[PDB]
Amino acid sequence: LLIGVATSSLALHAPSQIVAAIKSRADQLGASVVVSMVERSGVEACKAAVHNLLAQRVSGLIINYPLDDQDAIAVEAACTNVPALFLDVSDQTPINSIIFSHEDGTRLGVEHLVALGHQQIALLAGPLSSVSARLRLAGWHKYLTRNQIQPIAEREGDWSAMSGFQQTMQMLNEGIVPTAMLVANDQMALGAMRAITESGLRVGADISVVGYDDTEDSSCYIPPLTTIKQDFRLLGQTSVDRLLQLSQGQAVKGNQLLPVSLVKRKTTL
Amino acid sequence: LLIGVATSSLALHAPSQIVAAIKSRADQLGASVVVSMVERSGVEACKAAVHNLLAQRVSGLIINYPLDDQDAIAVEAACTNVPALFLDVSDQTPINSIIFSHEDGTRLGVEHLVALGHQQIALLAGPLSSVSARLRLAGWHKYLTRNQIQPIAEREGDWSAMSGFQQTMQMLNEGIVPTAMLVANDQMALGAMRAITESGLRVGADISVVGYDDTEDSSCYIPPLTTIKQDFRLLGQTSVDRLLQLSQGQAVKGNQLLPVSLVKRKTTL
Ligand SMILES: C[C@H]1O[C@@H](Oc2ccccc2[N+](=O)[O-])[C@H](O)[C@@H](O)[C@H]1O
Numbered sequence: 001l002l003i004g005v006a007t008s009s010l011a012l013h014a015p016s017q018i019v020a021a022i023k024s025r026a027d028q029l030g031a032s033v034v035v036s037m038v039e040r041s042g043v044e045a046c047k048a049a050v051h052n053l054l055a056q057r058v059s060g061l062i063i064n065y066p067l068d069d070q071d072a073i074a075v076e077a078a079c080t081n082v083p084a085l086f087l088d089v090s091d092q093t094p095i096n097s098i099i100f101s102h103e104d105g106t107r108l109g110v111e112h113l114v115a116l117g118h119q120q121i122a123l124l125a126g127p128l129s130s131v132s133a134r135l136r137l138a139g140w141h142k143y144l145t146r147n148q149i150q151p152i153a154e155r156e157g158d159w160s161a162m163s164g165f166q167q168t169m170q171m172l173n174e175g176i177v178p179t180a181m182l183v184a185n186d187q188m189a190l191g192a193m194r195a196i197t198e199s200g201l202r203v204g205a206d207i208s209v210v211g212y213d214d215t216e217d218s219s220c221y222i223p224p225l226t227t228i229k230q231d232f233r234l235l236g237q238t239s240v241d242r243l244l245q246l247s248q249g250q251a252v253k254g255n256q257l258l259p260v261s262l263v264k265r266k267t268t269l
Numbered sequence: 270l271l272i273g274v275a276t277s278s279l280a281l282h283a284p285s286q287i288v289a290a291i292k293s294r295a296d297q298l299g300a301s302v303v304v305s306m307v308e309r310s311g312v313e314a315c316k317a318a319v320h321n322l323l324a325q326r327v328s329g330l331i332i333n334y335p336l337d338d339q340d341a342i343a344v345e346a347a348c349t350n351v352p353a354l355f356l357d358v359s360d361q362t363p364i365n366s367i368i369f370s371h372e373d374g375t376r377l378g379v380e381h382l383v384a385l386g387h388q389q390i391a392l393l394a395g396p397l398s399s400v401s402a403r404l405r406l407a408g409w410h411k412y413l414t415r416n417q418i419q420p421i422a423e424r425e426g427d428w429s430a431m432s433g434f435q436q437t438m439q440m441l442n443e444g445i446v447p448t449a450m451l452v453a454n455d456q457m458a459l460g461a462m463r464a465i466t467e468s469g470l471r472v473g474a475d476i477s478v479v480g481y482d483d484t485e486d487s488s489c490y491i492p493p494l495t496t497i498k499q500d501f502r503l504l505g506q507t508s509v510d511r512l513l514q515l516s517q518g519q520a521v522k523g524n525q526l527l528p529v530s531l532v533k534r535k536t537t538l
Protein backbone atom coordinates (compact mmCIF):
# COMPACT_ATOMS: atom_id res chain seq x y z
CA LEU A 1 0.00 0.00 0.00
CA LEU A 2 2.40 2.77 1.06
CA ILE A 3 6.06 2.09 0.55
CA GLY A 4 8.91 4.04 2.12
CA VAL A 5 12.20 4.02 0.30
CA ALA A 6 15.27 5.23 2.22
CA THR A 7 18.03 5.76 -0.34
CA SER A 8 21.66 6.94 -0.37
CA SER A 9 21.89 10.44 -1.93
CA LEU A 10 19.93 10.53 -5.20
CA ALA A 11 22.73 12.47 -6.93
CA LEU A 12 24.37 9.30 -8.33
CA HIS A 13 22.32 7.88 -11.15
CA ALA A 14 22.03 4.35 -9.90
CA PRO A 15 19.88 4.69 -6.81
CA SER A 16 18.03 7.51 -8.51
CA GLN A 17 17.21 4.78 -11.04
CA ILE A 18 16.24 2.19 -8.38
CA VAL A 19 13.81 4.74 -6.98
CA ALA A 20 12.42 5.39 -10.41
CA ALA A 21 11.97 1.66 -10.79
CA ILE A 22 10.61 0.87 -7.36
CA LYS A 23 7.86 3.32 -8.22
CA SER A 24 7.08 1.95 -11.68
CA ARG A 25 6.19 -1.37 -10.11
CA ALA A 26 4.21 -0.06 -7.17
CA ASP A 27 2.34 1.96 -9.78
CA GLN A 28 1.78 -1.25 -11.71
CA LEU A 29 -0.54 -2.16 -8.84
CA GLY A 30 -1.76 1.08 -7.24
CA ALA A 31 0.51 1.12 -4.18
CA SER A 32 2.08 4.46 -3.21
CA VAL A 33 5.78 5.35 -2.85
CA VAL A 34 7.32 8.08 -0.71
CA VAL A 35 11.02 8.36 -0.99
CA SER A 36 13.24 9.69 1.74
CA MET A 37 16.91 10.12 1.08
CA VAL A 38 19.83 9.95 3.54
CA GLU A 39 22.21 12.75 4.67
CA ARG A 40 25.55 11.40 3.38
CA SER A 41 27.17 8.58 5.26
CA GLY A 42 26.93 7.05 8.72
CA VAL A 43 24.48 4.53 10.10
CA GLU A 44 22.91 7.21 12.25
CA ALA A 45 22.21 8.83 8.88
CA CYS A 46 20.06 5.98 7.55
CA LYS A 47 18.17 5.62 10.79
CA ALA A 48 17.33 9.35 11.10
CA ALA A 49 15.54 9.02 7.85
CA VAL A 50 14.15 5.55 8.41
CA HIS A 51 12.45 7.45 11.21
CA ASN A 52 11.38 10.39 9.13
CA LEU A 53 9.83 7.53 7.09
CA LEU A 54 8.17 5.47 9.76
CA ALA A 55 6.54 8.67 10.88
CA GLN A 56 4.40 8.60 7.69
CA ARG A 57 3.29 5.14 8.77
CA VAL A 58 4.50 3.50 5.58
CA SER A 59 3.11 0.00 5.32
CA GLY A 60 6.63 -1.20 4.55
CA LEU A 61 10.27 -0.17 4.02
CA ILE A 62 12.91 -0.62 1.34
CA ILE A 63 16.38 0.23 2.51
CA ASN A 64 18.68 1.02 -0.34
CA TYR A 65 21.60 2.44 1.58
CA PRO A 66 25.10 0.92 1.92
CA LEU A 67 25.46 -0.63 5.39
CA ASP A 68 27.96 -3.00 6.95
CA ASP A 69 26.81 -6.26 8.62
CA GLN A 70 26.63 -4.60 12.09
CA ASP A 71 24.89 -1.26 11.30
CA ALA A 72 22.50 -2.90 8.88
CA ILE A 73 21.29 -5.16 11.66
CA ALA A 74 20.62 -2.20 13.96
CA VAL A 75 18.61 -0.39 11.25
CA GLU A 76 16.32 -3.49 10.99
CA ALA A 77 16.25 -3.54 14.73
CA ALA A 78 14.99 0.00 14.32
CA CYS A 79 12.75 -0.93 11.36
CA THR A 80 10.17 -1.71 13.98
CA ASN A 81 7.89 -4.66 13.33
CA VAL A 82 7.19 -3.52 9.73
CA PRO A 83 8.33 -5.25 6.52
CA ALA A 84 11.84 -4.10 5.67
CA LEU A 85 13.89 -4.97 2.60
CA PHE A 86 17.56 -4.07 2.28
CA LEU A 87 19.03 -3.49 -1.13
CA ASP A 88 22.69 -2.45 -0.45
CA VAL A 89 24.23 -4.86 2.09
CA SER A 90 26.19 -8.12 1.88
CA ASP A 91 24.43 -11.39 1.49
CA GLN A 92 26.36 -12.71 4.42
CA THR A 93 24.42 -10.13 6.44
CA PRO A 94 21.59 -12.16 7.94
CA ILE A 95 18.43 -10.17 7.41
CA ASN A 96 16.10 -9.30 4.57
CA SER A 97 18.06 -8.35 1.48
CA ILE A 98 18.01 -8.57 -2.26
CA ILE A 99 21.46 -7.72 -3.67
CA PHE A 100 23.07 -8.28 -7.11
CA SER A 101 25.66 -11.03 -7.48
CA HIS A 102 29.00 -9.47 -6.60
CA GLU A 103 30.73 -12.83 -7.18
CA ASP A 104 29.28 -12.90 -10.68
CA GLY A 105 29.73 -9.26 -11.61
CA THR A 106 33.41 -9.46 -10.67
CA ARG A 107 34.19 -12.78 -12.37
CA LEU A 108 32.67 -11.63 -15.68
CA GLY A 109 34.88 -8.53 -15.71
CA VAL A 110 38.16 -10.35 -15.04
CA GLU A 111 36.90 -13.32 -17.02
CA HIS A 112 36.23 -11.33 -20.16
CA LEU A 113 39.39 -9.27 -19.82
CA VAL A 114 41.76 -12.19 -19.10
CA ALA A 115 40.41 -13.95 -22.17
CA LEU A 116 40.93 -10.76 -24.09
CA GLY A 117 44.65 -11.04 -23.64
CA HIS A 118 45.05 -8.38 -20.98
CA GLN A 119 47.64 -8.43 -18.21
CA GLN A 120 47.93 -4.97 -16.82
CA ILE A 121 44.51 -4.45 -15.34
CA ALA A 122 44.08 -1.34 -13.31
CA LEU A 123 41.32 -1.35 -10.70
CA LEU A 124 39.21 1.66 -9.86
CA ALA A 125 36.85 1.13 -6.93
CA GLY A 126 33.83 2.73 -5.31
CA PRO A 127 34.51 4.34 -1.96
CA LEU A 128 35.34 1.64 0.64
CA SER A 129 32.81 3.10 3.02
CA SER A 130 30.14 1.56 0.84
CA VAL A 131 29.81 -2.15 1.51
CA SER A 132 28.78 -2.85 -2.13
CA ALA A 133 32.02 -1.19 -3.17
CA ARG A 134 34.21 -3.36 -0.94
CA LEU A 135 32.56 -6.51 -2.20
CA ARG A 136 32.98 -5.40 -5.78
CA LEU A 137 36.61 -4.85 -4.88
CA ALA A 138 37.38 -8.06 -3.03
CA GLY A 139 35.30 -9.49 -5.87
CA TRP A 140 37.73 -8.44 -8.57
CA HIS A 141 40.68 -9.58 -6.45
CA LYS A 142 39.45 -13.17 -6.01
CA TYR A 143 39.30 -13.63 -9.78
CA LEU A 144 42.57 -11.86 -10.57
CA THR A 145 44.24 -14.09 -8.06
CA ARG A 146 42.32 -17.20 -9.15
CA ASN A 147 43.84 -16.01 -12.44
CA GLN A 148 47.31 -15.37 -10.95
CA ILE A 149 47.56 -11.72 -11.75
CA GLN A 150 48.53 -8.66 -9.75
CA PRO A 151 46.65 -5.47 -10.55
CA ILE A 152 49.19 -2.87 -11.75
CA ALA A 153 47.33 -0.28 -9.65
CA GLU A 154 44.22 -0.22 -7.52
CA ARG A 155 42.33 2.99 -6.69
CA GLU A 156 39.42 4.68 -4.94
CA GLY A 157 36.93 7.30 -6.03
CA ASP A 158 33.50 8.37 -4.89
CA TRP A 159 31.18 7.21 -7.73
CA SER A 160 31.42 10.79 -9.19
CA ALA A 161 32.48 10.89 -12.84
CA MET A 162 35.05 13.53 -11.96
CA SER A 163 36.71 11.07 -9.57
CA GLY A 164 37.03 8.77 -12.61
CA PHE A 165 38.88 11.60 -14.21
CA GLN A 166 41.03 13.01 -11.39
CA GLN A 167 42.01 9.55 -10.16
CA THR A 168 42.46 7.74 -13.50
CA MET A 169 44.13 10.84 -14.90
CA GLN A 170 46.71 10.53 -12.15
CA MET A 171 47.46 6.89 -12.25
CA LEU A 172 48.57 7.79 -15.79
CA ASN A 173 50.73 10.71 -14.57
CA GLU A 174 52.94 8.15 -12.75
CA GLY A 175 53.88 5.81 -15.62
CA ILE A 176 51.27 3.32 -14.42
CA VAL A 177 49.88 2.67 -17.86
CA PRO A 178 47.47 -0.31 -17.83
CA THR A 179 45.85 -1.91 -20.83
CA ALA A 180 42.51 -2.24 -19.20
CA MET A 181 40.82 -0.90 -16.16
CA LEU A 182 37.89 -2.32 -14.24
CA VAL A 183 35.79 0.68 -13.15
CA ALA A 184 33.46 0.22 -10.19
CA ASN A 185 30.49 2.04 -11.71
CA ASP A 186 29.79 3.63 -15.09
CA GLN A 187 29.86 7.22 -13.94
CA MET A 188 33.49 6.99 -12.93
CA ALA A 189 34.02 5.01 -16.10
CA LEU A 190 32.86 8.18 -17.93
CA GLY A 191 35.66 9.94 -16.13
CA ALA A 192 38.01 7.05 -16.93
CA MET A 193 37.50 7.10 -20.63
CA ARG A 194 37.51 10.89 -20.60
CA ALA A 195 40.87 10.90 -18.88
CA ILE A 196 42.35 8.19 -21.13
CA THR A 197 41.21 9.99 -24.26
CA GLU A 198 42.47 13.45 -23.31
CA SER A 199 45.82 12.02 -22.14
CA GLY A 200 46.20 10.90 -25.73
CA LEU A 201 45.09 7.33 -25.94
CA ARG A 202 42.48 5.51 -28.01
CA VAL A 203 39.87 4.01 -25.65
CA GLY A 204 39.17 0.36 -26.49
CA ALA A 205 42.32 -0.33 -28.52
CA ASP A 206 44.61 1.35 -26.00
CA ILE A 207 43.27 1.03 -22.51
CA SER A 208 40.03 -0.88 -22.36
CA VAL A 209 37.49 0.05 -19.73
CA VAL A 210 34.93 -2.23 -18.13
CA GLY A 211 32.32 -0.31 -16.28
CA TYR A 212 29.79 -1.57 -13.77
CA ASP A 213 25.99 -1.01 -13.80
CA ASP A 214 24.79 -0.30 -17.34
CA THR A 215 23.16 2.76 -15.92
CA GLU A 216 20.60 4.37 -18.27
CA ASP A 217 23.10 6.97 -19.80
CA SER A 218 25.99 4.75 -20.70
CA SER A 219 24.80 3.40 -24.11
CA CYS A 220 25.86 6.88 -25.24
CA TYR A 221 29.32 7.36 -23.76
CA ILE A 222 32.07 7.81 -26.32
CA PRO A 223 32.68 5.14 -27.28
CA PRO A 224 29.80 3.37 -25.51
CA LEU A 225 30.57 1.29 -22.50
CA THR A 226 31.24 -2.38 -22.01
CA THR A 227 29.81 -2.95 -18.57
CA ILE A 228 28.02 -5.03 -16.00
CA LYS A 229 24.28 -4.44 -16.22
CA GLN A 230 22.51 -4.78 -12.95
CA ASP A 231 18.82 -4.97 -13.85
CA PHE A 232 17.34 -2.13 -11.80
CA ARG A 233 13.87 -2.60 -13.16
CA LEU A 234 13.89 -5.91 -11.43
CA LEU A 235 15.46 -4.83 -8.16
CA GLY A 236 12.60 -2.41 -8.75
CA GLN A 237 9.95 -5.14 -9.24
CA THR A 238 11.16 -8.17 -7.23
CA SER A 239 11.77 -6.08 -4.16
CA VAL A 240 8.35 -4.33 -4.45
CA ASP A 241 6.48 -7.57 -4.75
CA ARG A 242 8.75 -9.26 -2.22
CA LEU A 243 7.77 -6.57 0.26
CA LEU A 244 4.24 -7.41 -0.90
CA GLN A 245 3.83 -11.02 0.13
CA LEU A 246 6.16 -10.05 3.00
CA SER A 247 3.59 -7.65 4.36
CA GLN A 248 0.89 -10.31 4.27
CA GLY A 249 3.15 -12.81 6.19
CA GLN A 250 3.95 -15.01 3.25
CA ALA A 251 7.80 -15.36 2.97
CA VAL A 252 10.49 -15.63 1.66
CA LYS A 253 12.44 -15.10 4.92
CA GLY A 254 16.01 -14.20 3.87
CA ASN A 255 18.30 -13.06 1.06
CA GLN A 256 17.90 -13.33 -2.69
CA LEU A 257 20.91 -12.84 -4.91
CA LEU A 258 20.20 -11.33 -8.34
CA PRO A 259 22.12 -12.34 -11.46
CA VAL A 260 24.05 -10.14 -13.78
CA SER A 261 25.19 -9.93 -17.37
CA LEU A 262 28.06 -8.34 -19.24
CA VAL A 263 26.93 -5.82 -21.77
CA LYS A 264 29.71 -6.01 -24.27
CA ARG A 265 30.05 -2.81 -26.15
CA LYS A 266 32.81 -0.77 -27.77
CA THR A 267 35.45 -0.12 -25.07
CA THR A 268 36.95 -3.63 -24.92
CA LEU A 269 39.36 -5.06 -27.52
CA LEU B 270 8.61 21.27 9.88
CA LEU B 271 8.25 18.76 6.93
CA ILE B 272 8.67 19.63 3.20
CA GLY B 273 6.90 17.74 0.44
CA VAL B 274 8.36 17.61 -3.02
CA ALA B 275 6.52 16.50 -6.18
CA THR B 276 8.76 15.68 -9.14
CA SER B 277 8.93 14.40 -12.69
CA SER B 278 10.74 11.03 -12.97
CA LEU B 279 13.88 11.00 -10.81
CA ALA B 280 15.50 8.97 -13.58
CA LEU B 281 16.34 12.27 -15.26
CA HIS B 282 19.35 13.85 -13.55
CA ALA B 283 18.45 17.46 -12.85
CA PRO B 284 15.36 16.80 -10.78
CA SER B 285 17.61 14.60 -8.59
CA GLN B 286 20.20 17.33 -7.98
CA ILE B 287 17.30 19.65 -7.30
CA VAL B 288 15.64 17.13 -4.97
CA ALA B 289 19.09 16.67 -3.38
CA ALA B 290 19.59 20.38 -3.04
CA ILE B 291 16.17 20.76 -1.48
CA LYS B 292 17.44 18.31 1.13
CA SER B 293 20.78 20.02 1.94
CA ARG B 294 18.91 23.17 3.08
CA ALA B 295 16.10 21.31 4.87
CA ASP B 296 19.09 19.63 6.53
CA GLN B 297 20.63 22.95 7.49
CA LEU B 298 17.31 24.24 8.95
CA GLY B 299 16.17 21.01 10.57
CA ALA B 300 13.24 20.27 8.25
CA SER B 301 12.55 16.78 7.05
CA VAL B 302 11.94 16.03 3.38
CA VAL B 303 9.68 13.63 1.64
CA VAL B 304 9.69 13.24 -2.15
CA SER B 305 7.12 11.56 -4.30
CA MET B 306 7.32 10.97 -7.99
CA VAL B 307 5.12 12.10 -10.82
CA GLU B 308 4.10 9.80 -13.63
CA ARG B 309 6.09 11.62 -16.29
CA SER B 310 3.01 12.70 -18.37
CA GLY B 311 -0.34 14.50 -17.77
CA VAL B 312 -1.51 16.86 -15.00
CA GLU B 313 -3.74 14.10 -13.68
CA ALA B 314 -0.24 12.72 -13.42
CA CYS B 315 0.98 15.42 -11.10
CA LYS B 316 -1.98 16.00 -8.84
CA ALA B 317 -2.50 12.30 -8.60
CA ALA B 318 0.24 12.96 -6.19
CA VAL B 319 0.75 16.15 -4.29
CA HIS B 320 -2.13 14.14 -2.80
CA ASN B 321 0.02 11.12 -2.40
CA LEU B 322 2.16 13.39 -0.40
CA LEU B 323 -0.58 15.22 1.53
CA ALA B 324 -1.48 11.83 3.01
CA GLN B 325 1.62 12.66 5.00
CA ARG B 326 0.58 16.18 6.04
CA VAL B 327 3.56 18.06 4.67
CA SER B 328 4.18 21.53 6.17
CA GLY B 329 4.58 22.96 2.59
CA LEU B 330 4.96 21.89 -1.02
CA ILE B 331 7.71 22.33 -3.56
CA ILE B 332 6.42 21.34 -6.88
CA ASN B 333 8.73 20.34 -9.71
CA TYR B 334 6.42 19.14 -12.46
CA PRO B 335 6.10 20.98 -15.73
CA LEU B 336 2.76 22.68 -15.59
CA ASP B 337 0.98 24.33 -18.48
CA ASP B 338 -0.71 27.68 -17.72
CA GLN B 339 -4.17 26.34 -16.78
CA ASP B 340 -2.96 23.28 -14.88
CA ALA B 341 -0.76 25.53 -12.74
CA ILE B 342 -3.77 27.03 -10.81
CA ALA B 343 -5.76 23.91 -11.44
CA VAL B 344 -3.25 22.58 -8.96
CA GLU B 345 -2.38 25.46 -6.66
CA ALA B 346 -6.06 25.20 -5.89
CA ALA B 347 -5.96 21.42 -5.25
CA CYS B 348 -3.36 22.00 -2.53
CA THR B 349 -4.46 25.40 -1.30
CA ASN B 350 -4.06 25.60 2.49
CA VAL B 351 -1.03 24.56 2.36
CA PRO B 352 1.69 26.69 0.89
CA ALA B 353 3.16 25.54 -2.39
CA LEU B 354 5.91 26.62 -4.66
CA PHE B 355 6.08 25.69 -8.30
CA LEU B 356 9.50 25.12 -9.81
CA ASP B 357 8.41 24.44 -13.39
CA VAL B 358 6.00 26.97 -14.89
CA SER B 359 6.10 30.19 -16.84
CA ASP B 360 7.05 33.39 -15.09
CA GLN B 361 3.60 34.45 -16.34
CA THR B 362 1.33 32.75 -13.79
CA PRO B 363 -0.29 34.25 -10.63
CA ILE B 364 1.03 31.28 -8.61
CA ASN B 365 4.23 31.43 -6.61
CA SER B 366 6.96 30.57 -9.10
CA ILE B 367 10.74 30.27 -8.91
CA ILE B 368 12.28 29.61 -12.33
CA PHE B 369 15.34 30.18 -14.37
CA SER B 370 15.59 33.24 -16.58
CA HIS B 371 15.19 31.50 -19.92
CA GLU B 372 15.53 34.87 -21.65
CA ASP B 373 19.04 35.08 -20.14
CA GLY B 374 19.67 31.36 -20.54
CA THR B 375 18.58 30.92 -24.17
CA ARG B 376 20.22 34.20 -25.23
CA LEU B 377 23.56 33.50 -23.57
CA GLY B 378 23.65 30.30 -25.60
CA VAL B 379 22.62 31.99 -28.88
CA GLU B 380 24.82 35.02 -28.45
CA HIS B 381 27.88 32.86 -27.80
CA LEU B 382 27.21 30.69 -30.85
CA VAL B 383 26.49 33.83 -32.87
CA ALA B 384 29.66 35.67 -31.84
CA LEU B 385 31.60 32.45 -32.30
CA GLY B 386 30.91 32.59 -36.04
CA HIS B 387 27.98 30.22 -36.65
CA GLN B 388 25.01 30.94 -38.86
CA GLN B 389 23.92 27.32 -39.45
CA ILE B 390 22.48 26.22 -36.12
CA ALA B 391 20.15 23.38 -35.29
CA LEU B 392 17.78 23.31 -32.33
CA LEU B 393 17.24 20.19 -30.23
CA ALA B 394 14.11 20.70 -28.26
CA GLY B 395 12.98 19.34 -24.96
CA PRO B 396 9.69 17.43 -25.01
CA LEU B 397 7.08 19.86 -26.16
CA SER B 398 4.74 19.08 -23.32
CA SER B 399 7.33 20.42 -20.83
CA VAL B 400 6.70 24.13 -20.73
CA SER B 401 10.27 24.47 -19.47
CA ALA B 402 11.26 23.02 -22.87
CA ARG B 403 8.86 25.39 -24.61
CA LEU B 404 9.97 28.46 -22.78
CA ARG B 405 13.53 27.62 -24.03
CA LEU B 406 12.84 26.99 -27.70
CA ALA B 407 11.08 30.35 -27.92
CA GLY B 408 14.06 31.89 -26.17
CA TRP B 409 16.41 30.42 -28.71
CA HIS B 410 13.90 31.36 -31.39
CA LYS B 411 13.52 35.07 -30.48
CA TYR B 412 17.30 35.65 -29.94
CA LEU B 413 18.32 33.50 -32.92
CA THR B 414 15.86 35.59 -34.86
CA ARG B 415 17.17 38.84 -33.41
CA ASN B 416 20.43 38.14 -35.17
CA GLN B 417 18.49 37.62 -38.33
CA ILE B 418 19.19 33.87 -38.08
CA GLN B 419 17.13 30.87 -38.92
CA PRO B 420 17.97 27.40 -37.62
CA ILE B 421 18.79 24.69 -40.15
CA ALA B 422 16.83 22.04 -38.41
CA GLU B 423 14.47 21.81 -35.42
CA ARG B 424 13.90 18.51 -33.63
CA GLU B 425 11.91 17.35 -30.58
CA GLY B 426 13.18 14.79 -28.03
CA ASP B 427 12.35 13.43 -24.59
CA TRP B 428 15.21 14.87 -22.51
CA SER B 429 16.83 11.43 -22.46
CA ALA B 430 20.35 10.66 -23.67
CA MET B 431 19.16 8.00 -26.17
CA SER B 432 16.92 10.56 -27.92
CA GLY B 433 19.72 13.05 -28.16
CA PHE B 434 21.19 10.21 -30.17
CA GLN B 435 18.12 8.98 -32.01
CA GLN B 436 17.41 12.53 -33.19
CA THR B 437 20.81 14.04 -34.01
CA MET B 438 21.00 10.93 -36.22
CA GLN B 439 17.58 11.27 -37.85
CA MET B 440 18.74 14.85 -38.56
CA LEU B 441 22.20 14.09 -39.93
CA ASN B 442 20.94 11.11 -42.01
CA GLU B 443 18.70 13.63 -43.83
CA GLY B 444 21.69 15.55 -44.98
CA ILE B 445 21.53 18.35 -42.40
CA VAL B 446 24.95 19.16 -40.97
CA PRO B 447 24.93 22.27 -38.69
CA THR B 448 28.11 23.81 -37.48
CA ALA B 449 26.80 23.99 -33.95
CA MET B 450 23.68 22.57 -32.30
CA LEU B 451 21.51 24.08 -29.51
CA VAL B 452 20.39 21.34 -27.21
CA ALA B 453 17.64 21.42 -24.57
CA ASN B 454 19.58 19.68 -21.78
CA ASP B 455 22.90 17.83 -21.25
CA GLN B 456 21.46 14.37 -20.87
CA MET B 457 20.33 14.92 -24.41
CA ALA B 458 23.46 16.80 -25.49
CA LEU B 459 25.29 13.60 -24.72
CA GLY B 460 23.51 11.42 -27.34
CA ALA B 461 23.77 14.53 -29.43
CA MET B 462 27.55 14.44 -29.25
CA ARG B 463 27.86 10.71 -29.80
CA ALA B 464 25.70 10.98 -32.85
CA ILE B 465 28.09 13.58 -34.31
CA THR B 466 31.03 11.52 -33.22
CA GLU B 467 29.82 8.33 -34.89
CA SER B 468 28.60 9.87 -38.19
CA GLY B 469 32.29 10.70 -38.53
CA LEU B 470 32.55 14.19 -37.24
CA ARG B 471 34.60 15.88 -34.52
CA VAL B 472 32.57 17.29 -31.62
CA GLY B 473 32.99 21.05 -31.23
CA ALA B 474 35.35 21.49 -34.20
CA ASP B 475 32.81 20.40 -36.80
CA ILE B 476 29.62 20.70 -34.90
CA SER B 477 29.76 22.57 -31.65
CA VAL B 478 27.13 21.61 -29.14
CA VAL B 479 25.74 23.89 -26.40
CA GLY B 480 24.06 22.23 -23.46
CA TYR B 481 21.55 23.52 -20.92
CA ASP B 482 21.93 22.59 -17.23
CA ASP B 483 25.45 21.74 -16.06
CA THR B 484 24.38 18.57 -14.33
CA GLU B 485 27.22 17.04 -12.27
CA ASP B 486 28.12 14.55 -15.11
CA SER B 487 28.79 17.24 -17.77
CA SER B 488 32.36 18.33 -17.00
CA CYS B 489 33.33 14.76 -17.82
CA TYR B 490 31.76 14.31 -21.27
CA ILE B 491 34.22 13.70 -24.13
CA PRO B 492 34.81 16.59 -24.55
CA PRO B 493 33.78 18.65 -21.53
CA LEU B 494 30.44 20.07 -22.57
CA THR B 495 29.99 23.78 -23.11
CA THR B 496 26.70 24.50 -21.40
CA ILE B 497 24.46 26.95 -19.59
CA LYS B 498 24.56 26.44 -15.81
CA GLN B 499 21.38 26.44 -13.81
CA ASP B 500 22.80 26.61 -10.24
CA PHE B 501 20.52 23.89 -8.79
CA ARG B 502 22.14 24.20 -5.34
CA LEU B 503 20.73 27.70 -5.20
CA LEU B 504 17.24 26.62 -6.27
CA GLY B 505 17.17 24.32 -3.27
CA GLN B 506 18.49 27.02 -0.93
CA THR B 507 16.14 29.53 -2.41
CA SER B 508 12.94 27.44 -2.63
CA VAL B 509 13.34 25.67 0.73
CA ASP B 510 14.16 28.94 2.37
CA ARG B 511 11.27 30.67 0.59
CA LEU B 512 8.89 27.86 1.54
CA LEU B 513 9.35 28.45 5.27
CA GLN B 514 9.36 32.30 4.76
CA LEU B 515 6.06 31.49 2.93
CA SER B 516 4.37 29.35 5.65
CA GLN B 517 4.32 32.33 8.06
CA GLY B 518 2.69 35.06 5.84
CA GLN B 519 5.86 37.20 5.80
CA ALA B 520 6.80 36.29 2.21
CA VAL B 521 7.27 37.59 -1.37
CA LYS B 522 4.33 36.69 -3.70
CA GLY B 523 4.42 36.23 -7.55
CA ASN B 524 7.04 34.66 -9.80
CA GLN B 525 10.54 35.11 -8.44
CA LEU B 526 13.07 34.30 -11.17
CA LEU B 527 16.83 33.72 -10.72
CA PRO B 528 19.85 33.78 -12.98
CA VAL B 529 22.02 31.42 -15.06
CA SER B 530 25.42 31.57 -16.80
CA LEU B 531 27.30 30.22 -19.85
CA VAL B 532 30.14 27.86 -18.90
CA LYS B 533 32.75 27.66 -21.60
CA ARG B 534 34.11 24.18 -21.98
CA LYS B 535 35.51 22.29 -25.04
CA THR B 536 32.37 21.78 -27.10
CA THR B 537 32.62 25.27 -28.47
CA LEU B 538 36.41 24.97 -29.05
C1 LIG C 1 25.81 3.70 -4.47
C2 LIG C 1 26.12 2.75 -5.65
O1 LIG C 1 24.96 2.07 -6.09
C3 LIG C 1 25.38 0.91 -6.80
O2 LIG C 1 24.21 0.11 -6.97
C4 LIG C 1 24.34 -0.86 -5.93
C5 LIG C 1 24.77 -2.12 -6.36
C6 LIG C 1 24.21 -3.35 -5.98
C7 LIG C 1 23.10 -3.38 -5.14
C8 LIG C 1 22.57 -2.18 -4.66
C9 LIG C 1 23.10 -0.93 -5.02
N1 LIG C 1 22.53 0.16 -4.51
O3 LIG C 1 22.95 1.53 -4.78
O4 LIG C 1 21.41 -0.06 -3.66
C10 LIG C 1 25.96 1.29 -8.16
O5 LIG C 1 26.53 0.11 -8.75
C11 LIG C 1 26.97 2.48 -8.04
O6 LIG C 1 27.00 3.29 -9.23
C12 LIG C 1 26.63 3.45 -6.92
O7 LIG C 1 25.62 4.30 -7.45
Ligand SMILES: C[C@H]1O[C@@H](Oc2ccccc2[N+](=O)[O-])[C@H](O)[C@@H](O)[C@H]1O
Binds near residue numbers: 281284287356401
Ligand atom coordinates in the same frame (compact mmCIF):
# COMPACT_ATOMS: atom_id res chain seq x y z
C1 LIG D 1 12.47 18.25 -17.03
C2 LIG D 1 13.70 19.20 -17.14
O1 LIG D 1 14.12 19.84 -15.91
C3 LIG D 1 14.99 20.97 -16.25
O2 LIG D 1 15.17 21.84 -15.13
C4 LIG D 1 14.03 22.75 -15.24
C5 LIG D 1 14.29 23.99 -15.88
C6 LIG D 1 13.98 25.27 -15.37
C7 LIG D 1 13.37 25.40 -14.12
C8 LIG D 1 13.06 24.24 -13.39
C9 LIG D 1 13.35 22.94 -13.87
N1 LIG D 1 13.03 21.86 -13.11
O3 LIG D 1 13.30 20.49 -13.52
O4 LIG D 1 12.39 22.11 -11.84
C10 LIG D 1 16.33 20.57 -16.84
O5 LIG D 1 16.87 21.70 -17.52
C11 LIG D 1 16.21 19.35 -17.81
O6 LIG D 1 17.37 18.51 -17.67
C12 LIG D 1 14.93 18.46 -17.66
O7 LIG D 1 15.15 17.36 -16.79
